[PDB]
């Protein structure tokens, strides 16, 4: 309740194994390896997660795809972030059932103060008290917080389809909160934190960036899709092409 809670919480992609061989000593190699295979396999899911949202197919199917290719990286830490709350309460980074994160592995990844910021951002949820409905909400809105400085292909349909989001961010703000003031408040401290997202997501760019172009000497695997991505969707963000919308200064 209402029709547009129900479809987020069916079309909520499933549990996603990174298939990491914790059989193995934990090598920067095989630790960062892993990661990519499970970015590329939570990239099948955001796909068919993204298409399967209320409105989506609204969006000119060039832009579907783009929106898709400059936000996943978004999307994946914040969700990856709850996990980490709602799984190990945030002590660790849960990115994923047979791949998690503890103080070692983050210094071993060669991104420990990156995995910090994660793990800061994984904090939040906790400290905020995010219910699963606002958490809903505001992943499908990290969908619609990047594109490029020029606008899309029909950036008419996009503005409609980010402005209706944030009005359901309201009515699940507002139903089940009697009170003017927490009201505001909640969407101070929500949009606060979807803004925070942004900075973390362009510091993974840049590492995730950096890693492909260095990727046979450090022996780091790179998936067919994450690899063209990466290094063609990517370099347009990080070159200032595309930008991450923010709602605060
Ligand atoms: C190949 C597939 C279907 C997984 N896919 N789809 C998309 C996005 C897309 C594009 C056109 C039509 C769609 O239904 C979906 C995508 C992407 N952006 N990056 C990598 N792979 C992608
Ligand atoms: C998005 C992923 C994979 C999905 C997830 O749970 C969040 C996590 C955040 C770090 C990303 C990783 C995918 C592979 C990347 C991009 C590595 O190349 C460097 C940073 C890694």
């Known amino acids: 309740q209402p029709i547009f809670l129900n479809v987020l919480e069916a079309i909520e992609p499933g549990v996603v194994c990174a298939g ?5 000593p934990d090598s920067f190699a095989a630790l960062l390896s892993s990661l990519n295979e499970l970015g590329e396999r939570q990239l099948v899911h955001v796909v068919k997660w993204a298409k399967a949202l209320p409105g989506f197919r609204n969006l000119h199917v060039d832009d579907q795809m783009a929106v898709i290719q400059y936000s996943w990286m978004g999307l994946m830490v914040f969700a990856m972030g709850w996990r980490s709350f709602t ?9 994923a059932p047979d791949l ?3 103080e070692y592995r983050m210094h071993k990844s060669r991104m420990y103060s990156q995995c910090v910021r994660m793990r800061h951002l994984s904090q939040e949820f906790g400290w905020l008290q995010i219910t699963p409905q606002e958490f809903l909400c505001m992943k499908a809105l990290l969908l619609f917080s990047i594109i490029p400085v020029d606008g899309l292909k029909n950036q008419k349909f ?3 389809l980010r402005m209706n989001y944030i009005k359901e961010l309201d009515r699940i703000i507002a139903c089940k909160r009697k009170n003017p003031t927490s009201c505001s408040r ?3 401290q929500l949009t606060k934190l979807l803004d925070s997202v942004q900075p973390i997501a362009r510091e993974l760019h840049q590492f ?3 890693l492909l172009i260095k990727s046979h000497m450090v022996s780091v695997d790179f998936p067919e899709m994450m ?3 990466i290094s063609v969707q990517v370099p347009k963000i990080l070159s200032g092409k595309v930008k ?3 709602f605060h200064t």
């Open 208 to 210: 995730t960036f950096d």
């Open 20 to 24: 990491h061989d914790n059989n193995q």
């Open 227 to 229: 690899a063209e991505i």
């Open 87 to 95: 799984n190990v309460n945030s002590r660790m980074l849960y990115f």
């Open 158 to 160: 996009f503005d409609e």
């Open 100 to 102: 998690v994160f503890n």
């Open 186 to 188: 909640r969407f101070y």
């Open 244 to 246: 991450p919308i923010y």
